[PDB]
Design a protein around this ligand. Structure first.
Ligand SMILES: Nc1ncnc2c1ncn2[C@@H]1O[C@H](COP(=O)(O)OP(=O)(O)O)[C@@H](O)[C@H]1O
Ligand SMILES: CC(=O)N[C@H]1[C@@H](OP(=O)(O)O)O[C@H](CO)[C@@H](O)[C@@H]1O
Ligand SMILES: [Mg+2]
Length: 355
């Protein structure tokens, strides 16, 4: 957007300084995020993606509930900056906008630099699961239906495949056939939720590493951010998605596949932190499925990238024509290694569960 428009958006909100700049910020794929610099404090300005989140009112009700509950326990969270009229967000010229205080003195990662960071991530998201269990499902309505319903995601993929809108399928048969051939594996968690053998828990559902901010001095988790997909699910969704993004030795969109590997050391680090917090609640069946949840969420995210590629990149932000194809290829590479290292990851979980 133009500065004129963005500065105009900013004037709707109860900011506490003269705005000097509003610049695109971050590696989030969904909302459109800006850093607001002023003569004092910083802010994050976001245009919410209403094609993905059509029910802005319900989305903001969830964010308000989660954040206000954290605040009421003296816990740092996202601080909504209200409109100058006291609302939690603003509809302006057909767009939905919100502002958060910029969370200061923090660092974040798109790639794990060492095991300690990822262990801390595990601890933080494990703790967040405990926090979220204080809510019952009825308080947090789904912001996106079938969000980690992998069989449903596969129906979406198959439809995108069959339509082949852009004729992109011809260049990615190996990737397509990978997802088609794994179709038998996609229902394991949904089946478990449906018949009661996996508990339905309130979950974050987007636990990739760059949705948590760590303190720049202590290295401890300061705040879990990107609260848009908090809703009922399985613990396995949060665990698996974290492993997907953070147990890789490479970026999500790394072009050079030789750099992309699944790290059992990073798997162990995260699991130690995560299970460490949830040992009192984790069931036998959840523990059994922890390794495979890595596979599952990586395949789900990968199929979604490839579906988006086949549909002309309508869902995820992209920087170049092949971006989603590049992303799907890292996810496949990771799953190939997770399959190969299945016995090691089983052993790692078994080991951590006793200790
Ligand atoms: N309150 C905040 N303080 C500092 N940084 C933030 C804040 N909120 C978001 N960010 C940064 O902006 C990025 C994108 O925001 P996010 O809510 O994750 O958007 P998306 O939904 O598009 O992923 C985050 O990954 C993080 O780096
Ligand atoms: C609401 C939504 O679709 N979020 C996506 C999206 O997360 P963001 O933090 O919003 O960029 O990109 C992820 C892949 O990087 C994917 O796993 C996730 O489900
Ligand atoms: Mg995000």
């Amino acid at each position: 957007e133009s500065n004129e428009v963005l500065f105009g958006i900013a004037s709707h909100f109860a900011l506490e300084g003269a705005v000097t700049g509003i610049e695109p910020y971050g590696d989030g794929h969904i909302n459109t995020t800006y850093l607001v610099t002023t003569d004092g404090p910083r802010y994050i300005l976001q245009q919410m993606n209403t094609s993905i989140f059509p029910d802005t009112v319900n989305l903001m009700r969830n964010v308000e509930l989660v954040t206000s509950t954290l605040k009421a326990q003296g816990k740092e969270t996202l601080d909504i900056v209200p409109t100058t009229s006291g609302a939690t967000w603003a509809e302006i010229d057909g767009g939905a906008w919100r502002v958060y205080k910029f969370i200061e003195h923090t660092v974040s990662y798109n790639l794990v630099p060492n095991p300690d960071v990822f262990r801390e991530a595990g601890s933080a998201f494990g703790d967040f699961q405990n926090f979220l269990s204080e809510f019952d499902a009825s308080q947090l309505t789904e912001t996106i239906a079938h969000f980690h319903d992998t069989p449903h995601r596969f129906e979406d993929f198959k439809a995108a495949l069959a339509a082949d809108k852009l004729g992109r399928a011809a260049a990615c048969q190996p990737e397509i056939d990978f997802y088609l051939s794994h179709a038998d594996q996609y229902a394991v968690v949904m089946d478990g939720l449906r018949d009661g053998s996996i508990p339905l828990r309130v979950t974050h559902n987007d636990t990739k590493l760059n949705n948590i901010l760590m303190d720049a001095t202590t290295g401890k988790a300061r705040a879990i951010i990107d609260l848009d997909t908090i809703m009922p699910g399985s613990m396995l969704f949060d665990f698996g998605d974290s492993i997907r993004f953070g147990a890789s030795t490479a970026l999500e969109d790394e072009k050079d596949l030789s750099k992309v590997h699944f790290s059992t050391e990073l798997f162990r680090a995260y699991t130690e932190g995560f299970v460490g917090e949830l040992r009192g609640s984790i069931t036998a069946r959840e523990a059994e499925l922890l390794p495979f949840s890595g596979n599952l969420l990586t395949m789900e995210c990968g199929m979604r990238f490839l579906a988006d590629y086949l549909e002309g990149d309508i869902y995820f932000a992209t920087k170049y024509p092949e971006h989603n194809l590049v992303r799907t290829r890292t996810q496949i590479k990771l799953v190939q290694e997770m399959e190969q290292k299945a016995s090691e990851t089983r052993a790692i979980v078994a080991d951590i569960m006793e200790a």
